[PDB]
Amino acid sequence: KAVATSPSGRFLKFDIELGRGAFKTVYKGLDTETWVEVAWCELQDRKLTKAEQQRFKEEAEMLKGLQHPNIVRFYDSWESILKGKKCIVLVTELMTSGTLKTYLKRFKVMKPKVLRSWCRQILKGLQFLHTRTPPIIHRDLKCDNIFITGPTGSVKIGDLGLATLMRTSFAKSVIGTPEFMAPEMYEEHYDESVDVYAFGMCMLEMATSEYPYSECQNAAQIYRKVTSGIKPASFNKVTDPEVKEIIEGCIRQNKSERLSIRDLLNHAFF
Numbered sequence: 001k002a003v004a005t006s007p008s009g010r011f012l013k014f015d016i017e018l019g020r021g022a023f024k025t026v027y028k029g030l031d032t033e034t035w036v037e038v039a040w041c042e043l044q045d046r047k048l049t050k051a052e053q054q055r056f057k058e059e060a061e062m063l064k065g066l067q068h069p070n071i072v073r074f075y076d077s078w079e080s081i082l083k084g085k086k087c088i089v090l091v092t093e094l095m096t097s098g099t100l101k102t103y104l105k106r107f108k109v110m111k112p113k114v115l116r117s118w119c120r121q122i123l124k125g126l127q128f129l130h131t132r133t134p135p136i137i138h139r140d141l142k143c144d145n146i147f148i149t150g151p152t153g154s155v156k157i158g159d160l161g162l163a164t165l166m167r168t169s170f171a172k173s174v175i176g177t178p179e180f181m182a183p184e185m186y187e188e189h190y191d192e193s194v195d196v197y198a199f200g201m202c203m204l205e206m207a208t209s210e211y212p213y214s215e216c217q218n219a220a221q222i223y224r225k226v227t228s229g230i231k232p233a234s235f236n237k238v239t240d241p242e243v244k245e246i247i248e249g250c251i252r253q254n255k256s257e258r259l260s261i262r263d264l265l266n267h268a269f270f
Contacts, residue, residue: 026041045088053079069156075093092159092162100147137195178219179201180202249263
């Protein structure tokens with residue numbers, strides 16, 4: 001049976017590892033109110049500074065009050081202080097139907113009706129985030145972080161609890177994916193147009209089934225291309241001219257000339 005219980009007593013932890021990476025370990029959890037499996041994520045405190053743990057504690061207090069049909073649910077989070085553990089626990093919605101990357105690695109061409117429906121649902125999720133008070137930036141948008149839901153084949157972007165943990169020094173240097181970062185995202189301050197940039201790289205990955213900036217071998221080569229206006233090589237492999245036009249407007253180096261979520265949703269293609 002269960003080996004741990006959330007402080008609220010709602011979620012139970014089972015000693016069943018569902019996944020493990022360089023950053024977190026995911027265990028099988030159980031929601032005692034709805035009787036569905038959840039993701040019991042654990043992050044060791046040695047990978048987070050004291051300031052990052054404190055900042056996440058305050059951000060998570062408001063993120064667990066956010067829900068959207070196109071966003072993976074972030075349920076709860078707390079600090080597990082015990083001998084041999086000393087970690088931060090995150091309880092999120094358990095996605096088992098794979099990601100967009102999972103099915104882009106197995107199929108060559110995506111139907112234009114499917115690319116239109118999925119990109120629109122992603123834009124709807126970002127629109128809901130950017131229009132909150134205060135605005136919320138996802139900061140971790142990529143096809144490897146967009147999950148399929150069983151019914152109707154809807155898509156959900158990764159939960160905000162794990163997405164905000166990608167800002168930490170450990171995540172940016174160990175599990176970072178700089179090929180989805182806007183040129184101004186490398187700086188100390190940026191805004192919500194960063195999500196528009198990452199969305200353009202997501203559509204580029206759907207339209208080509210190829211990883212953006214795959215010709216580069218290190219993050220330094222990716223930084224020099226992006227900060228010099230050099231588009232990735234797979235950008236020219238887009239067959240649809242209208243799709244290629246939307247992608248360019250999302251990955252423009254100058255964020256003032258870059259498209260907005262409003263312009264994308266009002267575009268004739270979406």
